[PDB]
Design a binder for this molecule. Structure first.
Ligand SMILES: CC(C)[C@H]1CC[C@H](C)C[C@H]1OC(=O)C[n+]1c(COc2ccccc2)n(C)c2ccccc21
Ligand SMILES: [Cl-]
Ligand SMILES: [Cl-]
Ligand SMILES: [Cl-]
Ligand SMILES: [Cl-]
Ligand SMILES: [Cl-]
Ligand code: NA
Lengths: 191, 189
């Protein structure tokens, strides 16, 4: 049994993320993908939206898919979110599943540089998903089958662009599910 | 009043097309957009799916949007489409609207090359849409048309058909109803 673990802040989630999870599930024959919204990033950058907003947008976006679910392990843990804690928690909850941790390739590079990965690679296989656009030699240096990079055209859609459109009152329709568009608007998330 | 005319083969329609139409409508303050599935393209290539399938997928995809609708005028005319016929038909149906014709930059290049572009520019404002990344340059230089980049057009009909052929999932690249219509009609097997 194989379980995908889609980590991110999901601020907001959009169709790029959903396509990514669907394609990774297909490529690696995953039985389910669990979306795990981050609790509080250690990574330097923008202040993220309140955790319950990012959780609810992720539930709304994934509800209709019988093979997707959403986990609160990172939001409920307390303190900053580390990938190794996420995988430990999910390994305990799903003891017989091989874990496939999936996130944006850039984000994954930062995790590996800052946190290291010998312990991470013992816990899960890793998949970095990248927007359309020497690194192979580097990938050959890594443990066999430990890390795969996958290009997803739909990741031309970005959370940054979605937030900027919302701030500028430009339409979000068809970049993300209807329910997420309306949740963003009626809770006034990105003004 | 301003009306967008979104021409395409829509084989299949996908979220890239819907984002593009929505973005053009916002940029140009269009009151509505009419999608017009075309006949067989002028350019030599694959035979597109039967017109009824492409029309139904476009209706399914746009039904929920109050500002979108679908027109049969090009598929009922028969043959490859002259854009001046499309614009004459839509002008008669919306005679007080200024028309904005939008299509893929590649289709627009074929229009400029094989159809009478001088007559065409009297009839509508032309907008080409493309994903980020030559006679068309002469008209752009004169501001006889405008090109708009749409990131979601990284999603392409070619990739959607290849995925269907290989039994790979189409979820979230296009509305659920289109995914299921493609599957249960076996369109790209
Ligand atoms: C840890 C690095 C050396 C290494 C991990 C395995 C992947 C093949 C990534 C590699 O990173 C890079 O190559 C460059 N890089 C990126 C760019 O991240 C990617 C990711 C995938 C493909 C290309 C670039 N970001 C965001 C970094 C942050 C800190 C240090 C180096 C970083
Ligand atoms: Cl993103
Ligand atoms: Cl609510
Ligand atoms: Cl009118
Ligand atoms: Cl002509
Ligand atoms: Cl049917
Ligand atoms: Na122009």
């Amino acid at each position: 049994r194989r379980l995908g673990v889609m980590g991110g802040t999901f601020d907001p989630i959009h169709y790029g993320h959903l396509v990514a999870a669907s394609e990774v599930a297909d490529l690696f024959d995953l039985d389910e993908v669990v979306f795990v919204p981050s609790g509080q990033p250690w990574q330097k950058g923008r202040q993220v939206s309140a955790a319950e907003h990012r959780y609810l947008m992720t539930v709304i976006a994934t509800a209709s898919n019988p093979r997707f679910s959403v986990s609160r392990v990172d939001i409920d843990r307390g303190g900053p979110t580390y990938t190794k804690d996420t995988l430990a928690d999910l390994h305990a909850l799903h003891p017989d599943s091989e874990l496939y941790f999936t996130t944006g390739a850039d984000a994954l590079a930062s995790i590996m540089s800052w946190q290291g990965w010998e312990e991470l690679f013992e816990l899960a296989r890793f998949v970095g998903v990248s927007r359309p656009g020497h690194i192979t030699s580097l990938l050959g240096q890594l443990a066999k089958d430990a890390l795969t990079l996958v290009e997803i055209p739909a990741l031309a859609i970005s959370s940054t662009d979605c937030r900027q459109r919302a701030e500028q009152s430009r339409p979000l329709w068809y970049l993300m599910p209807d329910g997420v568009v309306q949740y963003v608007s009626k809770r006034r998330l990105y003004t």
